[PDB]
Amino acid sequence: SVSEIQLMHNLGKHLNSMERVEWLRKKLQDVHNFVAL
């Protein structure tokens, strides 16, 4: 897409408002491990 670099157009699986709040819930069990398991 065009203009996809606004902070890398702060993209993350099309992170929206309800996706960023759930994102943060996943980043809570990630910031001290960084593993998808």
Side-chain angles (χ1 to χ4, degrees):
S1 318
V2 183
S3 204
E4 285 207 293
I5 208 84
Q6 172 231 272
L7 206 131
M8 305 147 278
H9 102 106
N10 127 88
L11 188 68
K13 313 152 272 98
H14 295 84
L15 251 160
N16 335 102
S17 292
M18 285 287 104
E19 226 259 85
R20 205 71 104 193
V21 54
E22 192 66 82
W23 130 240
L24 121 83
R25 292 211 215 92
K26 270 97 259 243
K27 98 156 111 82
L28 254 148
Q29 212 251 270
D30 154 83
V31 75
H32 214 263
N33 49 287
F34 302 98
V35 178
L37 205 142

